[PDB]
Amino acid sequence: GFVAKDDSLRTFFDAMALQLKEPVIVSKMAARKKITGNFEFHDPNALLEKLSLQLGLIWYFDGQAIYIYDASEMRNAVVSLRNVSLNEFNNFLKRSGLYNKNYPLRGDNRKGTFYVSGPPVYVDMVVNAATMMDKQN
Amino acid sequence: GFVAKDDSLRTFFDAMALQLKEPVIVSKMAARKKITGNFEFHDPNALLEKLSLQLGLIWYFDGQAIYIYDASEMRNAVVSLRNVSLNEFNNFLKRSGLYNKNYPLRGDNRKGTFYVSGPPVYVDMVVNAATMMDKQN
Amino acid sequence: GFVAKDDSLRTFFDAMALQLKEPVIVSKMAARKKITGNFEFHDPNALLEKLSLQLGLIWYFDGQAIYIYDASEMRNAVVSLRNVSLNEFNNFLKRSGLYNKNYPLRGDNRKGTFYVSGPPVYVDMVVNAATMMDKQN
Amino acid sequence: GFVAKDDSLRTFFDAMALQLKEPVIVSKMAARKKITGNFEFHDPNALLEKLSLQLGLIWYFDGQAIYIYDASEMRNAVVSLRNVSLNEFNNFLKRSGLYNKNYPLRGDNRKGTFYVSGPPVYVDMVVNAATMMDKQN
Numbered sequence: 001g002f003v004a005k006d007d008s009l010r011t012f013f014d015a016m017a018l019q020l021k022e023p024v025i026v027s028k029m030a031a032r033k034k035i036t037g038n039f040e041f042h043d044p045n046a047l048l049e050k051l052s053l054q055l056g057l058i059w060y061f062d063g064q065a066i067y068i069y070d071a072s073e074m075r076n077a078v079v080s081l082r083n084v085s086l087n088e089f090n091n092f093l094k095r096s097g098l099y100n101k102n103y104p105l106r107g108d109n110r111k112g113t114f115y116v117s118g119p120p121v122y123v124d125m126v127v128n129a130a131t132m133m134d135k136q137n
Numbered sequence: 138g139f140v141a142k143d144d145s146l147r148t149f150f151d152a153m154a155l156q157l158k159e160p161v162i163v164s165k166m167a168a169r170k171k172i173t174g175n176f177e178f179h180d181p182n183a184l185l186e187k188l189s190l191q192l193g194l195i196w197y198f199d200g201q202a203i204y205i206y207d208a209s210e211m212r213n214a215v216v217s218l219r220n221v222s223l224n225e226f227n228n229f230l231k232r233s234g235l236y237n238k239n240y241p242l243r244g245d246n247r248k249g250t251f252y253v254s255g256p257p258v259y260v261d262m263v264v265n266a267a268t269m270m271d272k273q274n
Numbered sequence: 275g276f277v278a279k280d281d282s283l284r285t286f287f288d289a290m291a292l293q294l295k296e297p298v299i300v301s302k303m304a305a306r307k308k309i310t311g312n313f314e315f316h317d318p319n320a321l322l323e324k325l326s327l328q329l330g331l332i333w334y335f336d337g338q339a340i341y342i343y344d345a346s347e348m349r350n351a352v353v354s355l356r357n358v359s360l361n362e363f364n365n366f367l368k369r370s371g372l373y374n375k376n377y378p379l380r381g382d383n384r385k386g387t388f389y390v391s392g393p394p395v396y397v398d399m400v401v402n403a404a405t406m407m408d409k410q411n
Numbered sequence: 412g413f414v415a416k417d418d419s420l421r422t423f424f425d426a427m428a429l430q431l432k433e434p435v436i437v438s439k440m441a442a443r444k445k446i447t448g449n450f451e452f453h454d455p456n457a458l459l460e461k462l463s464l465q466l467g468l469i470w471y472f473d474g475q476a477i478y479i480y481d482a483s484e485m486r487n488a489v490v491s492l493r494n495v496s497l498n499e500f501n502n503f504l505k506r507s508g509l510y511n512k513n514y515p516l517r518g519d520n521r522k523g524t525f526y527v528s529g530p531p532v533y534v535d536m537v538v539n540a541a542t543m544m545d546k547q548n
Contacts (some may be wrong), residue, residue: 064348070160070201072202
């Protein structure tokens, strides 16, 4: 529950996440809308999805921090390891705590190549893990 | 719905896009007209096409941002990959969310060459994706 | 037992640890919450787990200092010794005073490679001990 | 015997050691607690063990100076001489005036290698004696 005549969306998301003891990051563009009015009796997961639908936001949680971006920040990137086979790479990237539209990965036709489609922290985490796993191989 | 005795077209488009929670970009030339009067009971898609017809605008949406240019900004560019065949390149560029007059692509007679005809962000996105796909090949 | 209308979590943890003559470290992010109210008749181990659950903290004790981090600080790192076999390395790392979720280690599929998953002081201690044991071999 | 409403532990230990004409060193972390109240009729060895238990201190005496550290300062270090066999090295390190938990040494599995586990002045003295004995060999 929260009421306000006007505060930045960023502040609503920050207060929400902090109320639930969940570390949050909010992109500079994800936010920049304003919010006005009152939320009450709203289950937390429902507040997050409703805020995300109206402001066109996509979030990514990695068990540590809740990353909140504008949906328009989602991009595609291609990762093509040099020393390690893509099937082995996927075996290491794959996890039961993976989340998406925000963070989908899939093998593509390009030899030994996968495409990562999602928010910036997705692509950066998968790319860095990629480069390290490739250097080990 | 909106009324005004006079504001820059840019401001009408910005207020419109923001009213619908859609990230917008407006070229420096796309805008520079002025608008006067009132719109009401107008379905949003209809406001966009009517504004575009009168001011000679072409828009491009990529699922993230609505790019608005003057129609006179549309250009042609030729992309000729060095390592990848044009048929394979098209297979990667092609998408169900492609839009045009703003963003048409087609194979031409010039060997392993396609022509991209559309607004600047079209040509820049397709060219960059081109160069990357070619470097992978 | 402690009462306060408002002090930083960091100060509660510091006062707690010092009351029990236990050297403490508190990460810059582990803390930054505020605490309000009173604790009483609370067994010390219970205060630590309750503070940790509410503020999403993970602690690591090595017989010298109690390290307190936010749970979101836990990371994974891969150690691949060059001169020493991983089975021998584990024989040296293993101890009856090892603690985790904060500080788990396990062999992975990657040849002569283990993964260390836990708070920063975990990963730093195991990595440094690793490098030294490897230099000896 | 001593009374005080409040003085640094460091000062209690200093006054204690000086009362018994025993040169003392107190680490910067060993001390930094405060002491309040009175000790009386207390046998000196008993004062030392009680102060050490409450403040979590470990002491090391080498016949010259009483070194007082926090127990959390104890570390492990591996010494692997290059020219001298470890069995001969132990024959030289060993003494009837050796003290521990503060200063234990033992042969390990690593070839021609012992582990020294104890306070800083332990490890520094044994390491320096090690290097000299090795240079002689």
